[PDB]
Design a protein around this ligand. Sequence first.
Ligand SMILES: CCOC(=O)[C@]1(CS)N[C@@H](C(=O)O)C(C)(C)S1
Ligand SMILES: [Zn+2]
Ligand SMILES: [Zn+2]
Length: 240
Amino acid sequence: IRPTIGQQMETGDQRFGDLVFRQLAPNVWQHTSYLDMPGFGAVASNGLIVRDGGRVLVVDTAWTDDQTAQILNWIKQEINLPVALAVVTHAHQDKMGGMDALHAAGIATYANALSNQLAPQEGMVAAQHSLTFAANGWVEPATAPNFGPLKVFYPGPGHTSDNITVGIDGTDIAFGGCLIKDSKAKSLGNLGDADTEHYAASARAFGAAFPKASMIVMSHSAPDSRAAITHTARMADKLR
Ligand SMILES: CCOC(=O)[C@]1(CS)N[C@@H](C(=O)O)C(C)(C)S1
Ligand SMILES: [Zn+2]
Ligand SMILES: [Zn+2]
């Protein structure tokens, strides 16, 4: 695909059906799925796959159940370990559109409690479990059982009021989801669900929560350096 929004395909990318997978680190891969929007073309959305010992952890579904089932198929082929859990980073179609494929496979799913509360209104299937957060934004660990290397952080409202972010312990990788755009981005996208007053602070909070991450993975750009966080925050400063 040659998406209008999202990175092009590069050497080292693997095509598996209509999905693209890229290894980012020895136990981390980016999954990419595409949704065609009329007149506007293909929009890429990225999530993560993490191998944690004898199990696999997933961050975000694909746009659709069928695509998300193909993520599970790719995992079976390339990793061949059971998927223990998935965490989805807000209640939009690119992040939660494939929940049914996860639940059909018996995979435990997790989301911000607010994401689960909003899911019906957003046309999404709620996750099976709800994460809650301390006042400093870090997940309450009782609500993130056996998350292994996944360090979940709620940076505050930005892209949506429920957006969460995930650091991958033992790697240089932090996932900003749809909150962060890369340093070449010209806009933060549509902003219809956004908190334009708090966006900038939330972007900076994400950077401060994962201060040593050097590879920033995001939903709608290829991985970038930490400049993606600052550039996003500075674009968000102009919304106030
Ligand atoms: C089907 C709903 O999914 C969307 O429309 C997203 C989800 S974040 N929002 C858009 C935006 O923020 O402009 C986008 C093009 C980045 S994908
Ligand atoms: Zn979104
Ligand atoms: Zn998105």
